[PDB]
Structure 1
Amino acid sequence: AEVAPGDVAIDGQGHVARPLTDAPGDPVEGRRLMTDRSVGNCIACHEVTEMQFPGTVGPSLDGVAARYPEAMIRGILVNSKNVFPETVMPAYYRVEGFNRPGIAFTSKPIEGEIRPLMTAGQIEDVVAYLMTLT
Protein backbone atom coordinates (compact mmCIF):
# COMPACT_ATOMS: atom_id res chain seq x y z
CA ALA A 1 0.00 0.00 0.00
CA GLU A 2 1.58 3.25 -1.24
CA VAL A 3 0.28 6.83 -1.00
CA ALA A 4 -0.13 7.87 -4.69
CA PRO A 5 1.26 11.24 -5.85
CA GLY A 6 -2.17 12.92 -5.74
CA ASP A 7 -2.64 11.95 -2.09
CA VAL A 8 0.39 12.97 -0.09
CA ALA A 9 -0.20 14.95 3.10
CA ILE A 10 2.07 17.99 3.06
CA ASP A 11 2.07 20.66 5.80
CA GLY A 12 2.81 24.37 5.18
CA GLN A 13 6.58 24.07 5.47
CA GLY A 14 6.36 21.26 2.89
CA HIS A 15 7.18 18.65 5.54
CA VAL A 16 5.53 15.18 5.10
CA ALA A 17 5.01 13.58 8.45
CA ARG A 18 4.16 9.96 7.55
CA PRO A 19 5.97 7.43 5.27
CA LEU A 20 4.76 7.08 1.63
CA THR A 21 4.45 3.34 2.00
CA ASP A 22 4.01 0.74 4.70
CA ALA A 23 7.02 -1.19 3.45
CA PRO A 24 10.02 -0.42 5.74
CA GLY A 25 12.75 1.58 3.95
CA ASP A 26 15.89 -0.40 3.10
CA PRO A 27 18.89 1.99 3.46
CA VAL A 28 21.11 -0.32 1.46
CA GLU A 29 18.85 -0.03 -1.55
CA GLY A 30 18.59 3.69 -0.79
CA ARG A 31 22.36 4.00 -1.14
CA ARG A 32 22.18 2.22 -4.49
CA LEU A 33 19.35 4.47 -5.80
CA MET A 34 21.20 7.68 -5.01
CA THR A 35 24.14 6.78 -7.20
CA ASP A 36 22.04 5.11 -9.88
CA ARG A 37 22.26 7.56 -12.77
CA SER A 38 18.92 6.32 -14.08
CA VAL A 39 16.90 6.81 -10.91
CA GLY A 40 18.10 9.15 -8.24
CA ASN A 41 21.28 10.45 -9.88
CA CYS A 42 21.61 12.50 -6.66
CA ILE A 43 25.41 12.52 -6.80
CA ALA A 44 25.22 14.71 -9.95
CA CYS A 45 24.51 17.52 -7.45
CA HIS A 46 25.40 16.31 -3.92
CA GLU A 47 28.46 15.10 -2.14
CA VAL A 48 28.09 12.35 0.50
CA THR A 49 31.50 11.39 1.84
CA GLU A 50 30.13 8.27 3.52
CA MET A 51 29.81 6.78 0.04
CA GLN A 52 33.05 9.48 -6.90
CA PHE A 53 33.17 12.94 -8.49
CA PRO A 54 30.11 14.43 -6.77
CA GLY A 55 28.65 17.69 -7.96
CA THR A 56 28.65 20.96 -5.99
CA VAL A 57 25.27 22.40 -7.10
CA GLY A 58 23.66 21.11 -3.93
CA PRO A 59 24.98 21.13 -0.33
CA SER A 60 26.95 18.20 1.06
CA LEU A 61 24.40 15.81 2.60
CA ASP A 62 26.84 14.76 5.33
CA GLY A 63 25.06 15.32 8.64
CA VAL A 64 21.73 16.08 7.02
CA ALA A 65 19.93 13.79 9.50
CA ALA A 66 21.52 15.62 12.41
CA ARG A 67 20.18 18.94 11.02
CA TYR A 68 16.68 18.31 9.55
CA PRO A 69 13.87 16.07 10.86
CA GLU A 70 12.72 13.05 8.84
CA ALA A 71 9.47 14.70 7.82
CA MET A 72 11.45 17.57 6.22
CA ILE A 73 13.82 15.19 4.39
CA ARG A 74 10.82 13.24 3.10
CA GLY A 75 9.22 16.57 2.02
CA ILE A 76 12.36 17.54 0.06
CA LEU A 77 12.03 14.25 -1.90
CA VAL A 78 8.32 14.42 -2.60
CA ASN A 79 8.49 17.94 -4.07
CA SER A 80 11.56 19.90 -3.22
CA LYS A 81 9.85 23.13 -4.36
CA ASN A 82 7.45 22.90 -1.34
CA VAL A 83 10.51 23.15 0.94
CA PHE A 84 12.92 25.23 -1.24
CA PRO A 85 10.73 27.34 -3.59
CA GLU A 86 12.34 27.71 -7.01
CA THR A 87 15.11 25.13 -6.17
CA VAL A 88 16.84 23.41 -9.11
CA MET A 89 16.51 20.06 -7.35
CA PRO A 90 13.96 17.88 -9.22
CA ALA A 91 10.54 16.91 -7.80
CA TYR A 92 10.78 13.18 -7.39
CA TYR A 93 7.17 12.43 -6.49
CA ARG A 94 5.37 14.80 -8.91
CA VAL A 95 3.39 13.66 -11.95
CA GLU A 96 1.83 16.92 -13.20
CA GLY A 97 2.86 20.31 -14.50
CA PHE A 98 5.91 19.50 -16.61
CA ASN A 99 6.63 21.37 -19.91
CA ARG A 100 7.56 18.91 -22.76
CA PRO A 101 8.33 15.89 -20.56
CA GLY A 102 10.08 13.17 -22.50
CA ILE A 103 10.37 9.38 -22.05
CA ALA A 104 13.76 9.18 -20.18
CA PHE A 105 16.40 10.52 -22.63
CA THR A 106 14.81 9.26 -25.83
CA SER A 107 13.39 12.67 -26.86
CA LYS A 108 9.96 11.04 -27.35
CA PRO A 109 6.89 12.71 -25.74
CA ILE A 110 5.31 10.93 -22.75
CA GLU A 111 1.79 10.29 -23.96
CA GLY A 112 -0.76 9.48 -21.29
CA GLU A 113 -0.02 8.81 -17.65
CA ILE A 114 3.20 10.29 -16.28
CA ARG A 115 4.98 8.15 -13.69
CA PRO A 116 7.02 9.90 -10.93
CA LEU A 117 10.79 9.97 -11.14
CA MET A 118 10.90 7.62 -8.15
CA THR A 119 8.34 5.21 -6.61
CA ALA A 120 6.98 5.59 -3.04
CA GLY A 121 9.14 2.64 -2.06
CA GLN A 122 12.26 4.10 -3.68
CA ILE A 123 11.68 7.31 -1.82
CA GLU A 124 11.32 5.57 1.56
CA ASP A 125 14.55 3.67 0.84
CA VAL A 126 16.49 6.89 0.13
CA VAL A 127 14.95 8.50 3.15
CA ALA A 128 16.11 5.53 5.29
CA TYR A 129 19.59 5.96 3.88
CA LEU A 130 19.62 9.69 4.50
CA MET A 131 18.57 9.03 8.06
CA THR A 132 21.86 7.18 8.59
CA LEU A 133 23.70 10.44 7.87
CA THR A 134 24.13 11.71 11.47
Structure 2
Amino acid sequence: AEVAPGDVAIDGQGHVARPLTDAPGDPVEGRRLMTDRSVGNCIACHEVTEMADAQFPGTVGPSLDGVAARYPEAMIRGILVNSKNVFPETVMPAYYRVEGFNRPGIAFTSKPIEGEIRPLMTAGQIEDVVAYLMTLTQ
Protein backbone atom coordinates (compact mmCIF):
# COMPACT_ATOMS: atom_id res chain seq x y z
CA ALA A 1 0.00 0.00 0.00
CA GLU A 2 1.79 3.10 -1.21
CA VAL A 3 1.63 6.76 -0.35
CA ALA A 4 1.11 8.50 -3.69
CA PRO A 5 3.27 11.56 -4.61
CA GLY A 6 0.59 14.08 -3.75
CA ASP A 7 -0.26 12.50 -0.39
CA VAL A 8 3.20 12.53 1.26
CA ALA A 9 3.36 14.22 4.66
CA ILE A 10 6.39 16.47 4.70
CA ASP A 11 7.37 18.60 7.70
CA GLY A 12 8.99 21.99 7.71
CA GLN A 13 12.50 20.65 7.30
CA GLY A 14 11.51 18.59 4.30
CA HIS A 15 11.52 15.35 6.20
CA VAL A 16 9.22 12.39 5.65
CA ALA A 17 8.89 10.21 8.77
CA ARG A 18 6.48 7.77 7.17
CA PRO A 19 7.68 5.18 4.67
CA LEU A 20 6.20 5.59 1.17
CA THR A 21 5.23 1.92 1.24
CA ASP A 22 4.58 -0.96 3.69
CA ALA A 23 6.94 -3.13 1.63
CA PRO A 24 10.06 -2.75 3.80
CA GLY A 25 12.91 -1.45 1.67
CA ASP A 26 15.46 -3.90 0.20
CA PRO A 27 19.05 -2.59 0.80
CA VAL A 28 20.41 -4.93 -1.86
CA GLU A 29 17.98 -3.76 -4.59
CA GLY A 30 18.58 -0.23 -3.35
CA ARG A 31 22.30 -0.55 -4.10
CA ARG A 32 21.49 -1.58 -7.65
CA LEU A 33 18.98 1.16 -8.32
CA MET A 34 21.46 3.98 -7.62
CA THR A 35 23.73 2.94 -10.52
CA ASP A 36 20.97 2.56 -13.11
CA ARG A 37 20.83 5.82 -15.11
CA SER A 38 17.26 4.90 -16.16
CA VAL A 39 16.04 5.12 -12.55
CA GLY A 40 18.00 6.97 -9.91
CA ASN A 41 21.23 7.63 -11.77
CA CYS A 42 22.75 8.60 -8.46
CA ILE A 43 26.44 7.90 -8.98
CA ALA A 44 26.44 10.39 -11.83
CA CYS A 45 26.53 13.02 -9.04
CA HIS A 46 27.54 10.90 -6.04
CA GLU A 47 30.45 8.78 -4.83
CA VAL A 48 29.66 5.79 -2.68
CA THR A 49 32.98 4.19 -1.75
CA GLU A 50 31.23 1.09 -0.32
CA MET A 51 30.11 0.70 -3.96
CA ALA A 52 33.71 -0.31 -4.77
CA ASP A 53 32.58 -1.55 -8.19
CA ALA A 54 30.87 1.89 -8.70
CA GLN A 55 33.11 3.15 -11.54
CA PHE A 56 33.41 6.89 -12.29
CA PRO A 57 31.18 8.42 -9.60
CA GLY A 58 30.39 12.10 -10.09
CA THR A 59 31.51 14.84 -7.71
CA VAL A 60 28.62 17.25 -8.17
CA GLY A 61 26.93 15.96 -5.02
CA PRO A 62 28.82 15.27 -1.78
CA SER A 63 30.12 11.72 -1.19
CA LEU A 64 27.34 9.68 0.37
CA ASP A 65 29.72 7.91 2.77
CA GLY A 66 28.33 8.11 6.26
CA VAL A 67 25.08 9.84 5.31
CA ALA A 68 23.30 7.45 7.71
CA ALA A 69 25.49 8.71 10.55
CA ARG A 70 24.68 12.37 9.89
CA TYR A 71 21.07 12.47 8.77
CA PRO A 72 18.14 10.52 10.24
CA GLU A 73 16.04 8.26 7.99
CA ALA A 74 13.18 10.80 7.62
CA MET A 75 15.55 13.47 6.27
CA ILE A 76 17.13 11.02 3.85
CA ARG A 77 13.72 10.00 2.52
CA GLY A 78 12.71 13.67 2.36
CA ILE A 79 15.75 14.25 0.16
CA LEU A 80 14.50 11.59 -2.26
CA VAL A 81 10.88 12.71 -2.23
CA ASN A 82 11.88 16.24 -3.08
CA SER A 83 15.46 17.29 -2.55
CA LYS A 84 14.37 20.92 -2.90
CA ASN A 85 12.42 20.77 0.39
CA VAL A 86 15.66 19.96 2.13
CA PHE A 87 18.19 21.70 -0.14
CA PRO A 88 16.60 24.76 -1.77
CA GLU A 89 17.81 25.43 -5.34
CA THR A 90 19.64 22.13 -5.40
CA VAL A 91 20.51 20.60 -8.73
CA MET A 92 19.48 17.24 -7.25
CA PRO A 93 16.36 16.01 -9.12
CA ALA A 94 13.11 15.60 -7.20
CA TYR A 95 12.40 11.88 -7.34
CA TYR A 96 8.86 11.58 -6.13
CA ARG A 97 7.26 14.69 -7.63
CA VAL A 98 4.78 14.77 -10.50
CA GLU A 99 3.87 18.46 -10.97
CA GLY A 100 5.44 21.78 -11.74
CA PHE A 101 7.99 20.70 -14.26
CA ASN A 102 8.88 22.84 -17.30
CA ARG A 103 8.67 20.87 -20.57
CA PRO A 104 8.96 17.40 -19.02
CA GLY A 105 9.60 14.70 -21.64
CA ILE A 106 9.20 10.95 -21.70
CA ALA A 107 12.55 9.61 -20.51
CA PHE A 108 15.26 10.70 -22.96
CA THR A 109 13.05 10.45 -26.00
CA SER A 110 12.55 14.24 -26.34
CA LYS A 111 8.78 13.72 -26.65
CA PRO A 112 6.33 15.53 -24.32
CA ILE A 113 4.67 13.60 -21.51
CA GLU A 114 0.96 13.33 -22.35
CA GLY A 115 -1.15 12.36 -19.36
CA GLU A 116 -0.09 11.14 -15.91
CA ILE A 117 3.42 12.19 -15.06
CA ARG A 118 4.98 9.28 -13.24
CA PRO A 119 7.59 9.92 -10.54
CA LEU A 120 11.24 9.37 -11.41
CA MET A 121 11.10 6.60 -8.79
CA THR A 122 8.23 4.56 -7.39
CA ALA A 123 7.50 4.31 -3.66
CA GLY A 124 9.16 0.87 -3.66
CA GLN A 125 12.29 2.04 -5.47
CA ILE A 126 12.68 4.99 -3.06
CA GLU A 127 12.19 2.74 -0.06
CA ASP A 128 14.68 0.29 -1.50
CA VAL A 129 17.26 3.07 -2.00
CA VAL A 130 16.71 4.58 1.46
CA ALA A 131 17.02 1.15 3.02
CA TYR A 132 20.39 1.05 1.31
CA LEU A 133 21.46 4.59 2.19
CA MET A 134 20.78 3.62 5.82
CA THR A 135 23.56 1.02 5.66
CA LEU A 136 26.07 3.84 5.01
CA THR A 137 26.78 4.46 8.67
CA GLN A 138 30.40 3.87 7.68
- What is the CA-CA distance between 1:37 and the residue it aligns to? 1.1
Q: Is 2:49 aligned against 1:74?
A: no
TM-score (norm 1): 0.99
> Could you list the runs of 4 or more consecutive aligned residues of structure 1 that deviate by over 2 angstroms after TM superposition?
none
- What is the CA-CA distance between 1:132 and the residue it aligns to? 0.1
Q: Give the alignment's Cα RMSD to 1 decimal.
A: 0.4
Unaligned runs of 5+ in 1: none
**Partners in 1 of 2:109 and 2:15 — Cα distance?**
34
TM-score (norm 2): 0.96
Paired positions, count: 134
**Partners in 2 of 1:98 and 1:18 — Cα distance?**
25
**Partners in 2 of 1:25 and 1:18 — Cα distance?**
13
**Partners in 1 of 2:113 and 2:18 — Cα distance?**
30
**Partners in 2 of 1:85 and 1:55 — Cα distance?**
20
**Partners in 2 of 1:87 and 1:133 — Cα distance?**
22
* Residue of structure 1 equivalent to 2:130: 127
**Partners in 2 of 1:25 and 1:112 — Cα distance?**
29
Identity level (%): 100
* Deviations 1:7-41 (CA, angstroms, capped at 9, x unpaired): 00000000101100000100000000000111010
- Match of 2:34, SS state, is helix
**Partners in 1 of 2:18 and 2:113 — Cα distance?**
30
**Partners in 1 of 2:107 and 2:14 — Cα distance?**
27
